[PDB]
């Protein structure tokens, strides 16, 4: 089945360097235009640039807004493709998505990854401080403060818990984030059964599980 | 430098209801040597990477519900939904691929529905916090409609974080959680912590509230 995955992104000092990976599988890689796009959170799509197929000699084409600063490359043995990001500003903050393309008759075969945060800024990474939020229905909370960069992920028992959240968008403050999640269950299941939340920050290689209990 | 522009910028309509959305291209997108235009729409959902509806300008991709028309030609097209429905909540992109790529600034597409009360739970600090100096109250606002919304932090009778979470998928909802933020020594000075939580629902905010002593 086709996959595409970003990864290489996360913080990185104003004016610095930093090329993101995306791998690929599922189909014939060398055949595909292999495009770029970005989103800084909650603006808009840019496309940034792309590289062609075999039969086109693989050759690249960028937006004029990244044409000299922005490279990109595939490693066609990887099956992988690049992008290479130079003297990166804080307006190049954003999610990063690796696409499927091809020439505009063949629109439908577009595919895109999940995308990758880059945050650009000079504040220093800091792990998250999780903290639980006790009180016929019943709502649970996590409180998850003073961790830098975005972005931290949180669940409620490792997934099993999809219904009756609320993850709530961070928020920035003297350069720390601090995001919170409530979870809506009824009085039946807790504290009869355990109420997890989990929270994940890569960029600060944590993980940290937090059980709500009351009192 | 296609240039690509999408009017309007927002949408707000109750379901059932039909709606339309515009992009237009600084030069024609129409290929003479397939006799088809190289517009495509796309919808990104909070939380997803965009995922294409139409190609061609004209013809739907498969799964996507004939309630979604893609139409016009050369400079000029444009994406109908007859009958918007909850799951319809959305940004639409278009996007031309005639030569090179690009977005429009997109149409967010937000959702009326039945003036909706919001539900409000406290939450004092977390005996992990207190211990490490620090001390937030939490308030919970769930499922309410619409956004307007504010929240009054009584102590006994500034260092704020407010957050609404996008609007639901299914309920048309939104949340929202105010985090006054503390001092353990100044937290442990007074006693009724209270959120009055006004909205256009009521000329009386929310009671929700504890007294520290009693914790």
């Known amino acids: 089945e086709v996959k595409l995955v970003e990864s290489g992104g996360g913080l990185v000092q104003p004016g610095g360097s930093l090329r993101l990976a995306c791998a690929t599988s599922?189909?014939?890689?060398?055949?595909?235009?292999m495009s770029w796009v970005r989103q800084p959170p909650g603006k808009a799509l840019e496309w940034l640039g792309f590289?062609?197929?075999?039969?086109?000699?693989?050759?690249?084409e960028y937006s004029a807004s990244v044409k000299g600063r922005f490279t990109i490359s595939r490693d066609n043995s990887q099956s992988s493709l690049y992008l290479q990001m130079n003297t990166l500003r804080a307006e190049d903050s954003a999610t990063y998505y690796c696409?499927?393309?091809?020439?505009?008759?063949?629109?439908?075969?577009?595919?895109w990854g999940q995308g990758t945060l880059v945050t650009v800024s000079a504040a220093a990474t800091t792990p998250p401080s999780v903290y639980p939020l006790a009180p016929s229905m019943v709502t649970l909370g996590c409180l998850v403060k003073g961790y830098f960069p975005e972005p931290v992920t949180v669940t409620w028992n490792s997934g099993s818990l999809s219904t009756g959240v609320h993850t709530f968008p961070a928020v920035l403050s003297s350069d720390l984030y601090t995001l919170t999640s409530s979870v809506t269950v009824p009085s039946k299941t807790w504290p009869s059964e355990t109420v997890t939340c989990n929270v994940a920050h890569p960029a600060s290689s944590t993980k940290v599980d937090k059980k709500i209990v009351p009192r | 430098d296609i240039v690509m522009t999408q009017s309007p910028s927002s949408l707000a309509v109750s379901a059932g209801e039909k709606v339309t959305m515009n992009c237009k291209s600084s030069?024609?997108?129409?290929?003479?040597?397939?006799?088809?235009?190289?517009l495509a729409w796309y919808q990104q959902k909070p939380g997803q990477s965009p995922k294409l509806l139409i190609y061609?300008?004209?013809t739907r991709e498969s799964g996507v519900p004939d309630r979604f028309t893609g139409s016009g030609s050369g400079t000029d097209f444009a994406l109908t939904i007859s009958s918007v429905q909850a799951e319809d909540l959305a940004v639409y992109y278009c996007?031309?691929?005639?030569?090179?790529?690009?977005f429009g600034g997109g149409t967010k597409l937000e959702i009326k529905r039945a003036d909706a009360a919001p539900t409000v739970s406290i939450f004092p600090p977390s005996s992990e916090q207190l211990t490490s100096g620090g001390a937030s109250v939490v308030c919970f606002l769930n499922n309410f409609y619409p956004k307007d919304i504010n929240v009054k932090w009584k102590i006994d009778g500034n260092g704020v974080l407010n957050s609404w979470t996008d609007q639901d998928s299914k309920d048309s909802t939104y949340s929202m959680t105010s985090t006054l933020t503390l001092t353990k020594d100044e937290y442990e000075r007074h006693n009724s912590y209270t959120c009055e939580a006004s909205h256009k629902t009521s000329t009386s905010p929310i009671v929700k509230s504890f007294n520290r002593n009693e914790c």
């Open positions: 696409a499927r393309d091809h020439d505009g008759y063949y629109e439908r075969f577009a595919y």
């Open positions: 599922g189909f014939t890689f060398t055949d595909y235009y």
């Open positions: 590289i062609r197929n075999k039969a086109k000699g693989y050759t690249t």
């Open positions: 030069q024609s997108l129409l290929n003479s040597r397939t006799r088809k235009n190289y």
């Open positions: 061609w300008a004209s």
């Open positions: 996007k031309q691929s005639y030569n090179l790529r690009t």
